[PDB]
Design a protein around this ligand. Structure first.
Ligand SMILES: CCOc1cc(C(C)(C)C)ccc1C1=N[C@@](C)(c2ccc(Cl)cc2)[C@@](C)(c2ccc(Cl)cc2)N1
Length: 86
């Protein structure tokens, strides 16, 4: 299996709210649940659906931004990385 990561508490709370029922993940799983979270809460822009609006949301605190594009993979990996236990 791919490497296992441990989300810090704030990220863990987000992943669980999206439906995760464990505390240890592969990066693929973290990405999956983040997508599910964004979709369920409809944080994406209705007309430009690759844009995520995350002000007034834990995701914004986690990523340190008010908006981002799902196309920004390197940035998203970095934002996730600062929310994993080293
Ligand atoms: C929630 C919407 O997600 C996506 C939407 C679209 C459309 C433009 C077709 C709308 C396209 C792709 C996506 C889309 N890209 C993915 C695959 C992605 C996988 C890896 C990285 Cl590093 C980044 C993104 C994923 C799972 C995602 C979105 C957001 C986050 Cl924070 C995490 C995962 N969703």
């Amino acid at each position: 299996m791919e490497k296992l990561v441990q989300p810090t508490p704030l990220l863990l709370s987000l992943l669980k709210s999206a439906g995760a029922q464990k505390e240890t993940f592969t990066m693929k799983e973290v990405l999956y649940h983040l997508g599910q979270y964004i979709m369920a809460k409809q944080l994406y822009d209705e007309k430009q659906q690759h844009i995520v609006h995350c002000s007034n949301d834990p995701l914004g605190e986690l990523f340190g931004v008010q908006e981002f594009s799902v196309k920004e993979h390197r940035r998203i990996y970095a934002m996730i990385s600062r929310n994993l236990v080293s």
